[model samples]
Target chain A: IREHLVSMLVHNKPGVMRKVANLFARRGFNISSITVGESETPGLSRLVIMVKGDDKTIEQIEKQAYKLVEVVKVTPIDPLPENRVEREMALIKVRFDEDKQEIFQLVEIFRGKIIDVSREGAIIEITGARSKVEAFINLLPQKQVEEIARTGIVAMNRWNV
Target chain B: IREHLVSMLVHNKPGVMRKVANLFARRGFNISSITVGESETPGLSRLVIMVKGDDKTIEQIEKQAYKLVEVVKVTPIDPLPENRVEREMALIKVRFDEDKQEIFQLVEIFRGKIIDVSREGAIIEITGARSKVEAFINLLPQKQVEEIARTGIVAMNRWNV
Candidate 1:
């Protein structure tokens, strides 16, 4: 299966999120991640959804998604990772212990920022591609990890003439 | 009126996204943003959602969201932004043109990264709090802006003893 990134522009209405998500759920599409936030234009939100499917399936999914009333436009971004710019942010909470000194070095080498720290634990903020983020998570001491909140993938087309 | 951040742990199932979103839609909750991703635990995902409501309303909404079968747990994060680590990311596409030298400097000053560049345009990647990201976007030449994809807010509580 190939991973396809679909970008949608939809009206910033109450039910728009449910409508699009329902469409994907009903169609049995495997969604990797979905991120939605304000767009450049007011009253509109951009949704970047990552799904796993073959070529024909992704095309049909886009067609059906565009039919949603709140949806203004649906575009399939470049399939190749190099052809687009994709990023994600993650906030990870880890317990503060004596051995945690190495965690500080790990975060620094990864260029992550320690946003919150107390006597017991700290929250590290990291932004990068999926691989890089996951790598940082994996390298940490699994037992000390507390919780994780990740912003799903967001993407844009690479500049092209 | 207050902006509340609600975090949920739910089964990593297909319909869970739609179910949670539908609940919000049915209840008329004014959602600011919703971000969902895998959690540290297997077979579960963490959803961080932002909504605007009075104290009682937000509490009621949390109670309702917790009733879903797929939802494992619901926690209302500290309402005060300073009590948590909240982060967002944006990929901004801007048309390349003359007088763009200042754009580079502005992005640099904001510590944003240029992810893609061509003769026609470039995609800039930035991550920070909502205010910082918006400030960077606002500083850009409005007319040269092409498209924007933002990952909705993801947050975790600050470490407390």
Candidate 2:
């Protein structure tokens, strides 16, 4: 089994996601992440998924997903370093005792901002490539972290697919 | 129907997403976006769904989603102030002509960087509140923009939900 980035353009209907997801589930694929949003076309939505499996497994799922009534097209792009652009997002709520004000410095360095400052702590929004996201997390003191929510990686390529 | 932000905690197994999505599909709920990723819990995943429907429609879908064996809990948060945090992400590719190097200034302002500088165009990555994502796209001349992909929005609250 190998990791692959699969992107699809669908009719933006409710059941269509279930149908495509069902095909992957039935085929025993390991889906690490699934991100969906409206696409360039008005009635179509884009879905980028990260899953692990062999060649035959991917081929079958892609073919079956295309057969779904609401699916407009499905394309699985390679995760090569040069071909695609990939990004993930993270929201972190952190609190510290010695230097609460200094958190802004860290935020500035990471190109992040304090989105919401709550009683629990401050919520910081950071986004970028995978390691950048991880570095921000590691840069902070782990014990003081209250909560975190991450939108797993979504990617698309530079050229015609 | 209104834009409702719904969150769910579900088992980290395959096929579970299809089942929950089916509940929305069968009920005719219009899902504007759905983002899924591993949550804090080891065996559970966090799913944030943006759908267009009234409160009753949301309550019904939440009830059904909880009934699914794999779904441990479901929470539908209102988008009003004092309720939730909202953020979206985007990756855009643009080709600058005449003076091709001026785009970096705009990228730096948005806290984004050029992820790829291919022969065709430069790929920029940006994330944050929806407005920031939009502003980055707006800053670029429409003609220079080539391709874009987005992760609609994923939200969670400041309080325990």
Candidate 3:
């Protein structure tokens, strides 16, 4: 099965996310990630969902998604390897012991910042390509990580690509 | 009413989001922002929901959120001015004319990077606290903004605090 990244514009109303997600569930599709947020246009929430399926799976999902009452538009974003932008954002809480400067240097290299600092730990905010986020987390001392919140992978077609 | 940021751990299943959101709708609470991402723990997703409500409103939502079949736990992330981490991520496609260096400098100052470049425009990513994301968009030539995919606001209570 091939993987596809699709974007949908939906009414920013309560229960819309559930409606879209439940449609997938009813049809049995595996969701890699679903990221949603307010759109530049008012009253619309843009959702970037990654799903793995064959042509039939995508066709069914798209067809049913459009049928949902809250969906405004559903379009498959072309995932051309060289012609798209894919990114994810993550916030991590690292529990530290002694060394702080070293952690600060790593954050600088990654262009991350310390948002909260206490006697025992610091909260860091980092964002980049999915791989960059993964690599950053991997490099950090595993035991030091207290929690992580990730905005999955959100993508868009590169304009004028 | 003050804005309260709450985090919920739920089974990565369909219909959970719908149930949680419907509860808020039933109570007439407004959702300022909501961001969901995979949690560090396996088989669970972390939902960071920003809602405008008072103490009674929070108690009402929290009680029902826990009763959701898919929700494992719900907790309020105390977003103290000095003790919590808040961040939002956005991918912006800004239409261009000239002055590539000027654009690059803007990205650097915001600790963002150019992820996609085209003759027509470049897609840049900037991530920081909620305020930083808003400021970055404002500082950029407003008319050049073509599209944006934001992960909204996500938070975690600082561990050591």
Model 3 scores what on Cα lDDT? 0.79
Q: Please report how far candidate 1 places residue A107 from its true position, in Å.
A: 1.2
Tens digit of per-residue lDDT, candidate 2, span A6-94: 88888865467768877777767788788887665668888888887777756876877877778877887766857777888887778
TM-score of each: 0.96, 0.85, 0.87
Clash pairs (backbone) in predicted model 3? none
The list of candidate 3 runs beyond 4 A from truth reads: A98-102, B13-19, B22-28, B98-105, B139-143, B159-161
By lDDT, who's the top model here? 1
Model 2 chain B poorest ten-residue lDDT run: B152-161
DockQ, Cα level, model 3: 0.53
**Candidates' C-alpha lDDT:** 0.87, 0.76, 0.79
Cα lDDT of model 1 by residue, B1-161, tens digit: 88889899999876778888888888898888888888989899999988988878767887898779898888788877778778888999988579568888888999898888888878898988899999999988899999999988888778764
Candidate 1 lDDT score at position A14: 69
Local accuracy of candidate 2 as per-residue lDDT tens digits, B51-149: 877768777777778778898888777667476788888877787686465688888877786777756678788776777888777778887776667
lDDT tens per residue, model 1, A73-118: 8878898877887888899999867966898999999989888888
Instruction: Pick out the ten consecutive residues of candidate 3 chain A with the lowest summed lDDT.
Output: A14-23
Predictions' DockQ, in order: 0.81, 0.44, 0.53
